[PDB]
Amino acid sequence: QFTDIDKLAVSTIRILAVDTVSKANSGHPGAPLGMAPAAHVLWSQMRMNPTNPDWINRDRFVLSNGHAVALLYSMLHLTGYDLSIEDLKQFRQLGSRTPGHPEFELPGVEVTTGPLGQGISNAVGMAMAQANLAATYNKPGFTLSDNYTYVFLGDGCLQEGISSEASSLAGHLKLGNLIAIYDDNKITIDGATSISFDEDVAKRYEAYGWEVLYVENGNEDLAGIAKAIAQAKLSKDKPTLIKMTTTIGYGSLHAGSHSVHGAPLKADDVKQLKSKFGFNPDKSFVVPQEVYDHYQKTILKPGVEANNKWNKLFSEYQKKFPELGAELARRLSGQLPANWESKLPTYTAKDSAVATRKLSETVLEDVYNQLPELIGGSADLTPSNLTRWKEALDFQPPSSGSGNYSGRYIRYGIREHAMGAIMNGISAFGANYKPYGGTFLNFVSYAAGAVRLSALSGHPVIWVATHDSIGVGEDGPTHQPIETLAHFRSLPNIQVWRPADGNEVSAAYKNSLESKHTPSIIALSRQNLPQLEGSSIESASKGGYVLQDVANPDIILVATGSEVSLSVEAAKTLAAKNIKARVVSLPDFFTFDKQPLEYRLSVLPDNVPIMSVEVLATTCWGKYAHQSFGIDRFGASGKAPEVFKFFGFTPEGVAERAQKTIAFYKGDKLISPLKKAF
């Protein structure tokens, strides 16, 4: 039941968002103007505590079409979050809390968006995480988890393949608490949708297993939008898409035109809009008291009240179920179980040679019972990635017979990019979720859109990237990574681990799991690598360390992954010719760089030529080495041992190159590459 105040509220939102775009003289006025009625209706009906944006059982809202931020920021201020008019007045300004696109970092903003297709897929992960939480802690009498996941999306999000991957998955999993409202406005940047997007979205979504509702008058039908959302909530075993038709830039003189998509409305156009809406065309950033009063009563106070009930029920739960309550309390506090690192495996050079890919599996089998917040999966490569623990139950709808929602292993299908985004949503949900997904290192590139966002936002997700090099073999160049690590090591805020043996894999996993704001990629071998004499979790945890030392080395050999052993071998060959080579291992650039200069300079000193060894791109090595032995061309289809020989990665092949580096520099004074002038 809506009244004049609801209508007063809707104009305040449209005008506030417009004022905000115009003051910055940069921005997107269109969608905010067309989606305002939907926001009012939706937010009014959401269970959230603006004073605790962290409440675990809060209804969650994702703005997939991020360019419409002015709408998100307006709502945040009006409903009582930590966002003032002053903040809105510095929208898009260097240093403001109001950047051009929503960032995870701010309270009320659930994930960072801007790149189309990412928010809808993130919301899918958020709903999977809810389904899991509820199935794991809910007990009769204690419904600790039951929140909904709402999303706003545009034609752009529906055009990007990633949202298709996620919607396919979403429908298979039968995520009925996921409700998406689609801004069907018929406009995108180039112009009208018919110019390149004339497909039947409704029919495509039903094919996924989704429910589709329609709202023909999204510009004014508040009760219609209200009914569509309500019916949507009855869809228990089907996620819902509400195709709501609106007019881009509603109220504007150029409404319905793509000119109102991404430019501040012209001043006179703004004046007429205000007037039309009963506002003084001469004043800006005006919020009628009646609107603050309305949201206070409809949202803020009932939400606070709900958060309070939730806390009492939870305290009762901790009384009735001490083990579960303690666990949920801990996950909610964001701590990992005490001394969990104790269950991590350690080795000696006495043990057998294992593919780092299998050592990884061993780790999983060892910590899965220690970490109930660990939820894994693979994008159709479970047996190649070795990413499933034996006692795992799959995350599937109960009606499948293959598993249930309390399951902790996800079958992603061949959808790397969606996996990347779903993982971000699971991480973004809370309760200390530690998601990881597996694929071949070469195909993580398919997910670069999502991965960059794991780094930008700081979601500590884990990629179990197997088949890291030409060691892959016969599959060939289309499968063998070359530029992969160099790429990811150029991206800020992401660990790119490439462990050499058992001890190094445990360090890769301890640092990745202990991480709170940095995602990770663990590049694992297909082939067998031996256990090194000199490795350790403590030393590998530093990102880089001296594996084998000599007094007065003639050369320092730095390697990663499968090349550490080869370098160890090359050093034996070199010792025979009386050349002393110190061998350094560098499992992670990121972690190593984080160490204090004096440590790093103790591993990579002055006055010693340093040559790196890694069967991938050499373009990133200049920051640690003087000379580099790598592969700057695509691979080959052949038996792995033969492919290595063909590229010169033979012990004596490496030794020859160390000898050439010593000769080349003999007589020169050398500076560690670590040293910078400014």
Ligand X SMILES: Cc1ncc(C[n+]2csc(CCOP(=O)(O)OP(=O)(O)O)c2C)c(N)n1
Ligand Y SMILES: O=C[C@H](O)[C@H](O)COP(=O)(O)O
Annotated binding site: 28, 67, 114-116, 155-156, 185, 187, 261, 357, 384, 416, 443, 467, 475, 526
Breaks (C-N over 2.5 A) in the chain follow: none
Where do we find the tokens 């089907």? 238
Handedness of CA 400, 406, 411, 416 (dihedral sign): positive
**Does the protein bind ligand X through residue 185 (CB under 6 A)?**
yes
Find how far residue 137's CA is from the centre of its chain: 25
Structure tokens at 295: 């949201």
> Cβ-count burial of 587 within 10 angstroms (0-12 exposed, 13-18 middle, 19+ buried)?
buried
Contacts of residue 564, defined as CB under 8 A and 6 or more positions apart, other chains included, come to: 500, 501, 532, 547, 583, 585
**In this complex, which beta carbon is closest to Ca ion, that of residue 223 or of residue 414?**
414
Which residue, 56 or 162, is less far from its own copies as judged by CB? 162
- Our CB check for ligand X shows the closer of 189 and 349 to be 189
Task: Pick what 206 binds: Ca ion, its own copies, ligand X, none; C-beta below 5 to 8 Å, kind-dependent.
Answer: its own copies
Q: Which of 103, 160, 211, 416 is catalytic?
A: 416
Q: Is 354 helix (H, G, I), strand (E, B) or coil?
A: strand
The answer to whether the CB of 656 falls within 8 A of the CB of 663 is: no
If the CB atoms of residues 195 and 338 are measured against ligand X, the closer one turns out to be 195
Q: Where are the alpha helices (DSSP H) in 138-215?
A: 155-159, 161-172, 201-208
* Residue nearer to ligand X on the CB measure, 249 or 519: 249
- Which residue is associated with the tokens 């809370």? 430
Q: Which does 642 bind (CB under 5 to 8 A by kind): ligand Y, ligand X, its own copies, none?
A: its own copies
Identify residues 3-62 at the interface with ligand X (CB under 6 A).
30-31
Least distance to its own copies, CB of residue 382, Å: 5
Q: Is residue 185 within the footprint of Ca ion (CB under 5 A)?
A: yes
Q: Which of 19, 155, 327, 361 binds ligand X (CB under 6 A)?
A: 155
Annotated binding-site members for Mg(2+) = 155, 185, 187
Can you tell me which of 14, 67, 417, 487 binds ligand Y, judged by CB under 6 A?
A: 67
Residue 414 partner contact from ligand X, Ca ion, ligand Y, none using kind-dependent CB cut-offs of 5 to 8 Å: ligand X
DSSP string, 230-287: HHHTT-TTS-EEEEEE--TTTTSTTTTSGGGSSSPPPHHHHHHHHHHTT--TT--S--
Binding mask 69-108 for ligand X (x = CB under 6 A): ----------------------------------------
| Partners of 495 in the β-ladder | 520
Query: In terms of CB distance, is 140 or 383 closer to its own copies?
Result: 383
Name the segment binding ligand X (CB under 6 A); options: 151-159, 399-407, 458-466, 653-661: 151-159
Whether 504 is a known active-site residue: answer no
CB of 28 to ligand Y, least distance (A): 6
For 166, 308, 487, the CA distances from 117, given in Å and listed in that order, are: 9, 35, 22
Q: Comparing C-alpha atoms, which of 404, 533, 384 is closest to residue 465?
A: 384
Cβ-contact 412, 446 below 8 angstroms: no
**Cβ 490 to its own copies shortest distance, Å:** 4
Which residues are annotated binding-site positions for thiamine diphosphate? Answer: 67, 114-116, 156, 185, 261, 416, 443
Provide the mask over 472-491, with x wherever binding to ligand Y is found by CB under 6 A and - wherever it is not.
---x----------------
| 296 binding ligand Y? (CB under 6 A) | no
199 contributes a contact to ligand X by CB under 6 A: no
Report how many residues bind ligand X under the rule CB under 6 A.
25
Tell me which residue has tokens 């050369």.
555
Q: Terminal CA-to-CA distance of the chain, rounded, Å? A: 65
Which of its own copies, ligand X, ligand Y, none interacts with 569 (beta carbon under 5 to 8 A by kind)? none
Give the residue ranges of the annotated binding site for substrate.
28, 261, 357, 384, 467, 475, 526
Is 157 one of the binding residues for ligand X (CB under 6 A)?
yes
State which residue, 10 or 658, has the beta carbon closest to its own copies.
Answer: 658
Binding mask 9-38 for ligand Y (x = CB under 6 A): -------------------x----------
CB under 8 Å to 301, separation ≥6 — which residues? Answer: none
Burial classification of residue 667, based on how many CB atoms lie within 10 Å of its CB (0-12 exposed, 13-18 middle, 19 or more buried): exposed
- From 629, 632, 592, 587, select the one nearest 609 (Cα to Cα): 629
Q: 354: which strand partners?
A: 529
The residues, ordered by sequence, that sit 6+ positions from 439 with a Cβ below 8 Å of its Cβ are: 378, 379, 381, 385, 416, 419, 446, 447, 463, 464, 465, 466
Residues near 114 by Cβ (< 8 Å), separated by ≥ 6?
66, 67, 100, 101, 102
Q: Which does 526 bind (CB under 5 to 8 A by kind): its own copies, ligand Y, ligand X, none?
A: ligand Y
**68, 78, 134: which is closest to 101 by C-alpha?**
68
| Partner interacting with residue 556 (select from its own copies, Ca ion, ligand X, none; CB below 5-8 Å by kind) | none
Q: Which is nearer to its own copies, 98 or 506 (CB)?
A: 98
| 371-407 CB burial, b ≥16 within 10 A, e <16 | bbbbbbbbbbbbeebbbbbeebebbbbeeeeebbbbb
Place of tokens 């039968």: 174
Q: Fill in the per-residue mask, 129 to 158: x = in contact with Ca ion (CB under 5 A), - = not in contact.
A: -------------------------xx---
Stretch that binds ligand X, among 149-157, 268-276, 342-350, 422-430 (CB under 6 A): 149-157
Take residue 660 and report the two structure tokens written for it. Answer: 């050439």
DSSP state for residue 68 in the 8-state scheme: G
Q: Could you tell me the CA-to-CA distances from 403 to 46, 137, 381, 658 in Å, in that order?
A: 31, 17, 18, 55
Give the interface segment with ligand X, choosing from 113-121, 351-359, 457-465, 665-673 (CB under 6 A): 113-121
Nearer to ligand Y, 438 or 460 (CB): 438
Pick the piece of the chain touching ligand X (CB under 6 A) from 152-160, 203-211, 537-545, 565-573.
Answer: 152-160
| Nearer CB in complex with ligand X: 419/568 | 419
Placement of tokens 């701010």 in the chain: 106
Residue 378 interacts with which of ligand X, its own copies, Ca ion, none, CB < 5 to 8 Å by class: its own copies
Q: Is 386 in the site for ligand X (CB under 6 A)?
A: no
Residue choice 102, 108, 119, 156 for contact with ligand X (CB under 6 A):
156
Distance of CA 596 to the CA centre of its chain: 28
Interface with ligand Y (CB under 6 A), residue from 238, 388, 526, 600: 526
Per-residue tokens: 87: 């903040």
Q: Residue from 58, 67, 526, 657 that binds ligand X (CB under 6 A)?
A: 67
Q: Find the binder of ligand X among 182, 310, 443, 649 (CB under 6 A).
A: 443
Which one of residues 248, 270, 291, 359 is an interface residue with ligand X (CB under 6 A)?
248
Q: What is the 8-class DSSP label of residue 466?
A: E
Q: Which of residues 537-566 bind ligand X (CB under 6 A)?
A: none
Binding site for Ca ion (CB under 5 A): 154-155, 185, 187-188
Binding site for ligand Y (CB under 6 A): 28, 67, 262, 384, 475, 526
Binding site for ligand X (CB under 6 A): 30-31, 65, 67-68, 114-116, 154-157, 160, 183, 185, 187-189, 248, 261, 380-381, 414, 443, 446
Catalytic machinery residues: 416
